[PDB]
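2024-03-11 09:14:02 INFO receiving multi-entity request
2024-03-11 09:14:02 INFO entity count = six
2024-03-11 09:14:03 INFO echoing inputs for audit
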Amino acid sequence: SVSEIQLMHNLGKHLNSMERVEWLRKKLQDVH
Amino acid sequence: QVQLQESGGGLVQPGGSLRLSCAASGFTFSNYKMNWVRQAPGKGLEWVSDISQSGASISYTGSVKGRFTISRDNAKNTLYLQMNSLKPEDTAVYYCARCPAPFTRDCFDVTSTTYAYRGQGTQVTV
Amino acid sequence: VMTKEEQIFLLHRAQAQCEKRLKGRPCLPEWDHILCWPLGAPGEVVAVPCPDYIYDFNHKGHAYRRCDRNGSWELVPGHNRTWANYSECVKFLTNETREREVFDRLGMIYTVGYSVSLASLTVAVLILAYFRRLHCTRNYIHMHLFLSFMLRAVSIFVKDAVLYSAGYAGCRVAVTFFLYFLATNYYWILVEGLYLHSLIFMAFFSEKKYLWGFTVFGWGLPAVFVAVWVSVRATLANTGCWDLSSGNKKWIIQVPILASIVLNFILFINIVRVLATKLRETTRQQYRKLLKSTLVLMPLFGVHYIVFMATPYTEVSGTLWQVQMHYEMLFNSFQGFFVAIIYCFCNGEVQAEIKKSWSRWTL
Amino acid sequence: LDQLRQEAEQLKNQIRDARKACADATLSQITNNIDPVGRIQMRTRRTLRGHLAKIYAMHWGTDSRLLVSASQDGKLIIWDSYTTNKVHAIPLRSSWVMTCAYAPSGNYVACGGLDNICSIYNLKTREGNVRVSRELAGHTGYLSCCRFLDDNQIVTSSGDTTCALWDIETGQQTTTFTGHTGDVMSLSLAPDTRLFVSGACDASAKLWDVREGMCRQTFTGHESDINAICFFPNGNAFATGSDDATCRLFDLRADQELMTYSHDNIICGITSVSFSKSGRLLLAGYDDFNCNVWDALKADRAGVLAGHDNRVSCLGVTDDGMAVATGSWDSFLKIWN
Amino acid sequence: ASIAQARKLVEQLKMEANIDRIKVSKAAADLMAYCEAHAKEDPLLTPVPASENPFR
Amino acid sequence: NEEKAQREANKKIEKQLQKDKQVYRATHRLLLLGAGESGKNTIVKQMRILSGIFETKFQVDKVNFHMFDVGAQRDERRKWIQCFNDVTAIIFVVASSSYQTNRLQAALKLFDSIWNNKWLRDTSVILFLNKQDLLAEKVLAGKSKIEDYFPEFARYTTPEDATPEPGEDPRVTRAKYFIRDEFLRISTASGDGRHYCYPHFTCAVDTENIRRVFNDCRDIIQRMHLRQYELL
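2024-03-11 09:21:47 INFO inference complete, emitting structure
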């Protein structure tokens, strides 16, 4: 595949997953 | 004026020796590649031998290979053709020709009918 | 995959479901924004499976809560918070900074390479445009290729700055420009290959009929499938920034580009064959000359692209993916620099022109 | 014939001794009271583009604005040098053009080359178009130079080793000039158009009386073919450029060479020579792609016109001395000031 | 044949021997006088202003 | 007012000059050079059926070629040969059977002068050894005795890569390739990948000569393009 387009896709997916994990951890800390 | 004067041509028996000399004047001898070309009776001008500006590079026609030796003396502004193992077919007018331009690797027209930088020739009769 | 907004919507759906469910003494059910706990046994631990609407929670595990005997949920010792235990669902959570470190390393390497390529190619295009004797169809196509290289580099820079420093048009336009200019660089590498192949095999080349077509193909055909991708993205997905992949719609742009790579590689070997023939038609020295020619012709044809051309979207935490990413970032970023070096700075005609101009300027 | 050769040798010795007796001091000593001109820094003021192949020849107009140029792609392009605008683009029947002339009246141009024919084209026809006014045949070698005397007479030089004067009205050889033993490479008309000098591939220049048709004087000293020749502006001297990498200035009244413009670093021949308006500068084009402006009196190189990417084939100086046009094998004409 | 060519060459040499030659110094003086009398008319020898220069 | 008319006339000239530029670049110029007895005129006749210079227009595979035969020009070629510095090729025709006591040596010297001319150092030479049939008949008849005009022929041996014609005597191949290598000795000496020699064993009536010239011209153009890319 086109390496740079794939890298941009993977970086976006990783950032979205990291934001989701941070939100979940924030929810966990706020609740308990 | 470019002047090339040939001498040393004379009668000789077959298998003999003869040193043709060429006095050059009116130009820098060391700057020009030199040639010896003959005109046998009933024939056009034939190229025999050539020698480079310094004398390192030398070429002959096949018929005279191993028999004649071309040489140049830049200090004396002169050209020589030693002639050994002479044959009757070598009887001709020998013209000391000069290549038209200096510092060049091409030597156009030295066998031309009305070439300018060519001597009047000397008769060699075998 | 899944977005944060979609997960929040799913959480709201679960909250609504729990609210609908709500509408010696067992504990009353409650909603704590995480789980909907049913009636609890008096003075016993109540276990509820980890929710299925949260991906990162271990569905195999179960959370636990404590309840009293009078019917009140247990509170944390010394705190007003109710006692709870979400550890079983948070086992899979890990910092995992290695993936982001690898991403940052890749970013740094192609940023350095693309900056060097941009500088060298700006210098090269300035030199090519300034000198009038250098104006040739070969040098015209070179200048277009250098312009495509620098456009791809600067578009990558702008995309990174806009994207990583929000799903409005100012982000989607940057992503579109990135994809378009990357495609134009690939297709102008293909145009270089095609022009050399036509100069060799098409015995005698008509500049007027083919140069305009080459320019349009290099600059316009990438725009065709880039606009197709934009239209399909707007019609079918149109969600957030266009940074994220959406199904197989990513292959609208990538399938042509890779195809170009394929074609160019074929052209490359063919020309190398001709060189192997040419030196043959006139020993180890001819082999050395062929090796030097193919080495200097590799950057112009993008030969390095063929190694990882067919690699699919593999897992990031893999040796294949890491090798592909490092090799491709390095070589793609420095490809413009190498092309500029070979065809402008090491070019005999350009070197002679530079020397003559500088000597006449000093004199 | 032997007595003829002996008499010829005696005459050559007598001529050499007479020339030696007429020469007491060299041009350097006689020109001790004149200052050097210093560096002459001309620049390419115009670049005429449009020729496809090497330009072999150009000729300025009397107006010093319109000039004809001949390229071996088969084109005589008539240029307005002020605005670089092409005034005419005459396609030639034979693409192997080696010379071109522009009529003093400005109404005609000439060209010729390997086809041995001197073609005269009209510039001011009734319809305004350009037609072949006449073709002049009779040379048995390539036409190397041609210069108009007027609307009716033209002088041409040929590799046939001869020069001809043609009446353009009738297309006949008014006069023939024979004596050279090599291709005549160029000719130069005198300011009064009564005499003309021609250099040949016999390393000799010759001065010819146009009316008498005989060779008045023969000038020697060059070691190789003379490619270019031009009269000094005063009409009593001239200059030659040769393949021996030297230029030489001769004077007509003394019969011998006055000056030699040479340098060790110059090992290439001279294709074109042209004097400035005053004659103090001798501009010579060379095979090394450059042009040298020589201090004609001090025999020093006073300037270098560099910028041509190939062999400089032709030179021309305006009748008012304002600009120098240089053609070259790179297909471009450069106007210099 | 070559006899006619030799005759023509000898006649030309005779004609060139019969002509009179002035002193070289006199001709050099003539050329210097011409150059000095026309030096200021030479834009190449002495530059002309851009207003006078037609190829400005 | 006059300047506008001058500019309009200049533009009218420019469009026609662009057309002429396309026509000029679409055509390949060739210089056909050879001795009077080399069969060059017979080659001209064969190409034509299929004045100070003679012009022959012929098209091969829709490609235009303009060949120029030098006539009515003296034998002193050193000045008018410079007119053909930018031709596609100089087709040098040799009478291979003419080993003027020795015309072959004259052709060898002329080829050397052309090869080492500074203005022809970038011009490829297509070598047409035009008298292969006459050479074969002469060497078969036993009257050749080439060794006296060329002693180096005695020790010379036929090369390994030589491909003889069917039913060809080995001495024919030996002599023809000896002459070809005699020319290649000059050609290979300081060729340096700027101009190339294409020797061909030809006959004056060979219809393959036109195709040989076309293929050599194609090779010349390809090599020039590769040189522009610094590949050769």
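2024-03-11 09:21:48 INFO post-check: Chains A and B do not touch (no CB pair under 8 Å).
2024-03-11 09:21:48 INFO post-check: Helices of chain A lie at 3-31.
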